[PDB]
């Protein structure tokens, strides 16, 4: 079930103020994506670089408290790990009846970090592409989930935000908060971000440990990957399989099963299971409560890897 | 050591005919990339779709025999597995003194499938991006290796082909036939093509087996990957790490090491070792001698996967 442009009409927002809370990777694009489509947008963000960048973007930047007080659609675009602190201290006491409490990721609702009152709609519009892309695509996809419907229009108000940001153009698939949260987390951990970077690093290190030039390993392990995945996007694995040599495609077939075994699949099911049982959520929540001793260290190590170091010069010249 | 535009001058090709043998993924782009840069190109290909597509591209399409006879630079752009059959039956007897025998992949020279005579230069220009990209980039990278220098200019004649195709613009890194062959094969088997498709499929199947909607699994496992890798290209892992949520980056750190273990690294070293010992080459060579009973079956299975099936509708609408 996919809602499209004919399923939505932003007219439900004519005269309705959308408070974009936060102004970062998603906050800046969606606020400017609503901007063109005649959506009256007010940005609620703490003072800082987001505050003045949204100001120079021509918006009405105010505090999170004042933004909730003067809006009917509160769109939560702070970091997932900051949303509960800001909510109870600045949003909750200012929520009124019929307001929409919107998210673009279901983490804080699904794992009980934000417990909204009963007189607001709780819905989600989760775009699949990062901000900058949502911005420029509109200037010329997403999931929708309705957690709590108090007005009877939360689905159609959320599709007016989908239409306002312009996701009904490409198309919006309906899901739930649980299903979006669980699969969004699993994808970036097991495949998109955790698996691929670990796979790129392992290949790179096998070549450098094999005596091969580090700059050569950078090309065939990381740099050629963009060209490999672009073809996958346009037409799946089949298209990418056809642009590459039969020598490459045959290597794919006989080597993929060696790299990703039945044991890798069993570990992915454990990753998924820990997501479903809130165990990852707990890990990330307590991680932030502890002052990120683990996130900061591992972030610095990943940036000190030779793949990232040798990657500097290589990208400069060309 | 990187040769650049100032290191090459196509003038060594003024009045020199470059015979592009084959007209496919690489043949069409390089022949048209040389075309604009005043390079006199003659295409030598068997009759068929490549023969008439090169004809409608305005070239002088002739047989492989006649192309070698009337050219001074023979560029071998047939499939790696067809080059030895075509060579001995159509190239070898027509090679003369001072001709350049060029490749864009070192497989057939490094694994002793083509044994060139002593009176020709043997060199390589291996572009890192597939054809279509080489074409349009020139209209507005590569490795260079010199296997046999008989004229004393094979390196500078090959950089005139690099300049003629336009790789000296971005830049060309010098390698050997062995090093290009070994790492090109290892990259596509362990990382780019074999590892990633196996990793995408394993994630997708974990979600579908987990009860999740197949269309939802397509987005977070395959479709979002292009947007993930694009960021990696522009600025390494660091850049991609920053566009994604801290919730995503923290998942990366704690999950990558679970998916790609010390055991995955040991298996990659076995993949590499089998490449270095000619064992993969033998496998692929005998595979083709047998009538591809293994390549065809596995190709059909990969195209019948649900990820590719569900991928159809999803890409259509948007
Ligand atoms: N591409 C994605 O990463 C992606 C995909 C879909 C949906 N989402 C979801 O969208 C939401 C945010 O995504 P994001 O990646 O856009 O977050 P972001 O890029 O980190 O933007 C962060 C914003 O939060 C503000 N902020 C941080 N702490 C604050 C506080 N204590 N009080 C007030 N404002 C504060 C920052 O202002 P300063 O500049 O002052 O810190 C900045 O404007 C998350 O729920 C995320 O899961 C993101
Ligand atoms: N992106 C890459 O795949 C890539 C990367 C760098 C370098 N290379 C290297 O470049 C070379 C070819 O790459 P490719 O991927 O361009 O090959 P390709 O796309 O398969 O092009 C195949 C060409 O070979 C011709 N051909 C096949 N069998 C023939 C025969 N028996 N006699 C004459 N012509 C024949 C085809 O003509 P029909 O249409 O008549 O079959 C077609 O023109 C290989 O050495 C490859 O490793 C490729």
From Swiss-Prot, chains A, B:
Binding sites annotated in the UniProt record for Mg(2+) 1: 184, 188
Every KARI N-terminal Rossmann domain range: 1-175
UniProt family annotation: Belongs to the ketol-acid reductoisomerase family.
Taxonomic placement: Bacteria, Bacillati, Bacillota, Bacilli, Bacillales
EC number per UniProt: 1.1.1.86
Name recorded for this polypeptide: Ketol-acid reductoisomerase (NADP(+)) 2
Binding site for NADP(+): 23-26, 46, 50, 80-83, 131
Molecular-function GO terms, alphabetical: ketol-acid reductoisomerase activity; magnesium ion binding; NADP binding
Gene: ilvC2
Binding site for Mg(2+) 2: 184, 220, 224
GO biological process, one term: isoleucine biosynthetic process
Cellular component per GO, a single term: cytosol
Residues bound to substrate: 245
Swiss-Prot/TrEMBL cofactor(s): Mg(2+)
PROSITE patterns: KARI_C, KARI_N
């Amino acid at each position: 079930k996919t809602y499209y442009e004919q399923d939505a009409n932003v007219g439900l927002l004519q005269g309705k103020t959308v408070a974009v809370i936060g102004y970062g990777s998603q906050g800046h694009a969606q606020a400017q994506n609503l901007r063109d489509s005649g959506v009256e947008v007010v940005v609620g963000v703490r003072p800082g670089k987001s505050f003045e960048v949204a100001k120079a973007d021509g918006f009405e930047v105010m505090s999170v408290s004042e933004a909730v007080r003067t809006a009917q659609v509160v769109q939560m675009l702070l970091p997932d790990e900051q949303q509960a602190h800001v909510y109870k201290a600045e949003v909750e006491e200012n929520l009124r009846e019929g307001q929409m409490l919107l998210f673009s990721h279901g983490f804080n609702i699904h794992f009980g970090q934000i417990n909204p009152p009963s007189y607001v709609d709780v819905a989600m519009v989760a775009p699949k592409s990062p901000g900058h892309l949502v911005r420029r695509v509109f200037q010329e996809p997403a999931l929708v989930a309705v957690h709590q419907d108090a007005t009877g229009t939360a689905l159609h108000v959320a599709l007016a935000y989908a239409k306002g940001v312009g996701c009904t153009r490409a198309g919006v698939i309906e899901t739930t908060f649980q299903e979006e949260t669980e699969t969004d987390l699993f994808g970036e951990q097991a495949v998109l971000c955790g698996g691929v970077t670990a796979l790129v690093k392992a290949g790179f290190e096998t070549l450098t440990e094999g005596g091969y030039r580090p700059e050569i390993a950078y090309f065939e392990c990381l740099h050629e990957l963009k060209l490999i995945v672009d073809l996958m996007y346009e037409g799946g694995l089949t298209n990418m399989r056809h642009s590459i040599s039969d020598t490459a495609e045959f290597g794919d077939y006989v080597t993929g099963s060696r790299i990703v075994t039945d044991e890798t699949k069993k570990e992915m099911k454990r990753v998924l299971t820990e997501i479903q049982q809130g165990e990852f959520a707990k890990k990330w929540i307590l991680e932030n409560q502890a002052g990120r001793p683990t996130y900061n260290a591992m972030k610095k190590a990943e940036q000190n890897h030779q793949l990232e170091k040798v990657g500097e010069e290589l990208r400069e010249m060309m």
